[PDB]
């Protein structure tokens, strides 16, 4: 599909940089006609068929097509798309309270209540996506953002649809790979991937929310990946001695190597704790 090829600067003024990855720089912006504020994500296009710099049009089109489908309080929405010869420019809903990652950085470990108030939101965002057969494939504390960081119970949105895929057949085999600390063993072993892989990432996120520690992290990327495939983690007493046994049970049911035996998004919401390119 093609996108609007007008100069983006003719319709928006850009401000502060919000963030960066591989593939993209994200800038705060303001639409001239409405005075509303957005996050403009500039994704660099591939300059030649075989190049490794930039993102293939197929991958950009998949991100845009998934984003266009979304409308849920706990996920980011897509406002408009522009393009020019160098970039595709997604105008996304602005999430202005920073990454869950940075929130967790200053001050590092949450109460079970604070942890479950975030988690319940993440779970209903992911329930929506999975209901739509969308696997996010990049869930991690940097890809969650808070609408306002200065409120006692902040409200979150899932961002970064750069690896997301529609799962039409219950699994796909296109060979996706995110960040070693958060990927499920099936990603590590290059096996067919489905919605289950997001549920593993949620367990890793939950462990970190409760402890401030990463369950699989080794000293190098390859060692983390080995730990992940072996399900090499444990609940350190120093971190978990006063954490409830149900919280551990929740995590233990997500960090399961066989995706068929791992809790589904629906199971996670009924659980008693809750229920009211890749190398060194
Ligand atoms: N809607 C948004 N509002 C506010 N900040 C955002 C938004 N989208 C992205 N960011 C910030 O920009 C960073 C990069 O955007 P992201 O969508 O994560 O890019 P990417 O490079 O394609 N994927 P990755 O390599 O995993 O970062 C994020 O980590 C956030 O800090
Ligand atoms: Mg990202």
Author numbering: 2 to 277, 291 to 294
The authors write:
Death-associated protein kinase (DAPK) is a member of the Ca2+/calmodulin-regulated family of serine/threonine protein kinases. The role of the kinase activity of DAPK in eukaryotic cell apoptosis and the ability of bioavailable DAPK inhibitors to rescue neuronal death after brain injury have made it a drug-discovery target for neurodegenerative disorders. The most notable conformational changes occur in the glycine-rich loop region, an active-site region with potential for modulation of kinase activity.
The DAPK–AMP-PNP–Mg2+ crystals grew in a high concentration of ammonium sulfate and diffracted to 2.00 Å resolution. c OMIT map contained clear density for the nucleotide, including the β- and γ-phosphates and one magnesium ion. The positioning of the γ-phosphate in the new DAPK–AMP-PNP–Mg2+ structure is such that it is in a ‘kinked’ conformation similar to that observed in other kinase–AMP-PNP structures such as PKA, JNK3, GSK3β, CDK2 and phosphorylase kinase. Initial modeling and refinement revealed partial negative density located around the γ-phosphate of the nucleotide, despite the use of the highest purity nucleotide available (see §2). The adjustment of the occupancies of the γ-­phosphate and the OG1, O2G and O3G atoms to 0.60 resulted in elimination of the negative density in the refinement model, thereby allowing a comparative analysis between nucleotide-bound states. The improved density of the γ-phosphate of AMP-PNP allows a closer examination of protein atoms that are within hydrogen-bonding distance of the γ-­phosphate atoms and also those atoms within proximity that might be involved in the phospho-transfer process. The only protein atom that is within potential hydrogen-bonding distance is Asp139 OD1 (2.8 Å). In the AMP-PNP structure, the Mg2+ ion makes fewer interactions with the protein residues and only coordinates to Asp161 OD2, while other inter­actions are made with the O1A atom of the α-­phosphate, the O3G and O2G atoms of the γ-phosphate and a water molecule.
